[PDB]
Amino acid sequence: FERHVFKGIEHTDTGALVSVKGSGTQEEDVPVINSGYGFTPAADTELEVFLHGDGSDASNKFATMTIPRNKQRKWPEGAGGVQHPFNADKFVQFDDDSIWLKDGKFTLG
């Protein structure tokens, strides 16, 4: 396991490839293992990428991206949900009841 920053991101037809630095490894890193959430930062956006290495075979490393630390929503106690990757004030929150969609504009279709 190793934390690396984030440079670019190449999107092929088998999934997402990152281009993490921390040591210019992988102009195209194996993945982004998508557990149903995804996002596309601009190149050189200040965020961390965690590599999980197959076997210890550096050869293949799978990536987990975090949303930028200063953009993380401070969820209230009992609540949770999903947010915009770059905006802590745009989200779908599950609270005690409010399936709350926080924005000024919502589009359907």
Add this chain to the structure above:
Amino acid sequence: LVGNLVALALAPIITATEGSFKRHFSPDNIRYYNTEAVVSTMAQAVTQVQNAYLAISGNDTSQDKWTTVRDFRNVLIDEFTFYSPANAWNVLRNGFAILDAAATGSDKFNVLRNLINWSSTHSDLDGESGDAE
């Protein structure tokens, strides 16, 4: 426990000179209208040691020779460095240590001899000011 009588030990005289310097140098306890002169005398002495080092190194190119020169300027540029006996004595002793470690043997003759001529004068001020100089 045989003694290497082939060799000079400079540590005792260096500590003795340190004591004798810090006994008669307190630029916080001398009359206000002589402090600038006394501190200027100290800075001029350190300038002499710097010029000595630069005249003895000559064709030394390594980066140590670049940093040492930068440190001499940095210490001579600042103003409040020689107002404390600790910094003054440390600067003097390290300057002499570097002037020693810069060459070997014959090379260091004329340079050191010039220093003995420069410091062969006496102070004109009176009281504690003359004692400091």
Add this chain to the structure above:
Amino acid sequence: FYAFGEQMWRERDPRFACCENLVKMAAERGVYPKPAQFAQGYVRMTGTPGSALNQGLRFQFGNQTYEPASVVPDQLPATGILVLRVSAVNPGPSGNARVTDGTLVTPVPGISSAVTAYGGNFCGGSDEEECEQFRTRYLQRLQYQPRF
């Protein structure tokens, strides 16, 4: 033998001499070669008063790194503003720059990361003097100069 005498005369002529003999000759006449110089300037930082400070401060201006030259105080002064005499880390002319804003490399609690180049310029950066430049500078000291 004629050849050896000719060259033993030549090796004591400022213009024709190996660089080592050149410097050994010039140190006898006062002229010494010029060393390399680090860049220099003032850096202005701010933060909440009373915060602690350490000597391991490093600033990142543009693409260069700069370090404090004078002694850093133990705490930030009560005004909240500190102006520091700073020199570059690497010698040479790459330390020179014309910049106004920069960031603090090492994070310190209570001190904002954004620092400002007090004056906006970083002078001083110069490289080691070569042998032919020193030869032509030394030869310009002995020779007869009108309008000195």
Add this chain to the structure above:
Amino acid sequence: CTIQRPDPQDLRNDIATRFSTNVLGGAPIIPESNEFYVVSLEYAMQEE
């Protein structure tokens, strides 16, 4: 630089080689023969 007094033994080696090649057609300098004394004398001159 790169021009200074040769090593003594080096100097006599050079003088013996030059005397053997340019004069004796390559023959070695047998010790205690007249060529040995001539070579030694020359060296001596060069070192003085």
Add this chain to the structure above:
Amino acid sequence: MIKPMRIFIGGEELVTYTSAQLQRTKKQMTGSLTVEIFLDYVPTKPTIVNAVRGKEILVYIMGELAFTGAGGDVSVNFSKGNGYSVTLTARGRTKYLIDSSQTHPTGFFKNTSDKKVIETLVKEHNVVLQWDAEEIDEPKVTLRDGNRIYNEIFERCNQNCHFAYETRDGKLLITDGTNGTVGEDIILGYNILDFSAEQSEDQANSQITVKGHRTQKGVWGNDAIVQPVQTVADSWVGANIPLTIQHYGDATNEGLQRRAKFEADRRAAESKSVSVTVFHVWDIGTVHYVEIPPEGIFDVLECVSLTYTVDAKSTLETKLELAPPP
């Protein structure tokens, strides 16, 4: 009197020790006493044993302390013809730090200093600490669960140069420099019974680059993933023999350079090893002038090791391992 030793397992001044070897070293945390007792057996009369496996000893060398710490083991041998010997071994009092297992409750020291994390990793077995180096601050100190009381200290004093060894009283000395106390100028032809200097070249390194990550509070991204690096150099080795020894806690510029210089002193001190065997039986950190002209030594060296040996027949000799004059 030539008499060097007088051992006390508790007050019993050993008068039967047929031989002895006492070793002290800076490369490690402890020492190693090794006594040899006679222990006769008359198979009709009553016999008495001593099952010490822990009863505490010291070795006053030449009317002065040398060691302090039969804890090691008892090794009663047998044979028909020269049998009935008892080899006792005794490590240094700083041992349980070596053979234990950390049992501190928390496991997460927060906003502490290496000195403090070392004081609480030792005061679980009553080993007073002789801290004589400095105070370095570090945010996160998590001890691997039950690692070892000695591995963790060695890890915490290697990333900030601090020699960790044991003194003659029975304390743990965490130093950064020498023990002062200069002494005999061993000269070739004066007292060296035997010498062996070896300054090899397979254990040197020109540039040591220390990298890592920042573990402070709040610091993230580039300032904690990219910046921390340092490149210290030993302008004595020669050609480009690079290296990269990575760091494992709160990588500050000073932290980087300091781990770097620590290893740059280890490799340095291994690249000129001078073992000397002298005659009669105070040098665990002492510096001495040494003169061995045939191998070109005219220099001031630090004794890393010290071994006193004895055997009633032909012995009483001391083996020193010294430290390079870069």
Add this chain to the structure above:
Amino acid sequence: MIKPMRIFIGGEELVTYTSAQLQRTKKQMTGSLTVEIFLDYVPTKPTIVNAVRGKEILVYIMGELAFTGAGGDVSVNFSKGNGYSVTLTARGRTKYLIDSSQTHPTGFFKNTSDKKVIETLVKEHNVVLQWDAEEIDEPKVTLRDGNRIYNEIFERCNQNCHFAYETRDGKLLITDGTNGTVGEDIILGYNILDFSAEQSEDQANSQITVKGHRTQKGVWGNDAIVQPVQTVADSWVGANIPLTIQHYGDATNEGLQRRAKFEADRRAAESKSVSVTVFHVWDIGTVHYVEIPPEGIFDVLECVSLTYTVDAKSTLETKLELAPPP
């Protein structure tokens, strides 16, 4: 003339070496010269030393190069009675690859071949590469941060069978077969001063199964998690002694079978080790006919090792380690 050697530390034809041992091997990357010099010391006259710790040497054996690469160390000993000896050691020029630390900037070779990754992992210390095997292509080559210049090569030439050793000139030979150049038929009763053949059975294996994962671009799921496997067999051992040596890069069918056959040649070549000591002092990969009827050898074998030894008293002998005739 029996004269084999003439060593040159730079041009100084060693005439004092009291003994010597020169070892060359395929199981490793280097060799090991070990000279023994006299080095007198008259404690009134001036004495001179040589602090080489790196000054370069060669050993022309019997009017021909044998080694190329006093870098190792200097080991000036002492004693009263037979002292004043100097053991010099000299590894092979392909050494820094062994004791360094990779300093390539990127760390991620993309769409490269093993040859190229090896050329840039060597040309950092000026060791010309004698590539004489083949070009294998591989998508992802990430070097562990500062691993070692030799571990990484060994890893990259083991998963595609390629012996990695050093020649007599001073180069790195990455081969796949033999060096040709056949020679003397050693027969029992003709030149073998001594022999020892040992074909054990604890280091053999019937089926070697290589598994792994696919590291190509785009390939995912089953075609990169399930399929890659291979089962190579050595129809000489006997009963079912299975095994599973897993793979660590771009597991292709050919890649699998090739790592498999590489190890199936290692284990094979260890299951008949023939050490012979011959008399007077060219066989680092040579094949020879060997005839030792009492142990049933009538076969053509490859010398894996070669050791020339000498000592002015009773020596001049060569020790060969050979390769099995499956």
Add this chain to the structure above:
Amino acid sequence: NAIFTAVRVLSAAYLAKAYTETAATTVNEGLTQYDLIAAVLEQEAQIAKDDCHDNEFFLQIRAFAVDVARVMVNRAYNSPSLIVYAFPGTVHGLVAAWEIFGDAKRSRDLEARNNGSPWAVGPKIISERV
């Protein structure tokens, strides 16, 4: 002229190194090769001394010339110690080799130095010392 001088001096040096890498077949041959190279080097020294162009390169060339002299002369006279055996009347190659060395397989060695039909070599035969 600096270009030309560099090329000529480097060629003379490397041709000396080339001559030294091969064995002399006859004393006169080694001495003739040395004569060629020494003549080239003396020509270059006279050029580098003509009107005090550079005294230093003249001295350097002179030193390299004396070095090449010692090595080429030692090679011509002493690398194999060639002697002229005096045979009564011309003789075969095999017989001459066997009588000189006691090993007739060394007849191949007597052909590179002596000119004369293989069945009649002599009556003076150049070969190596014994």
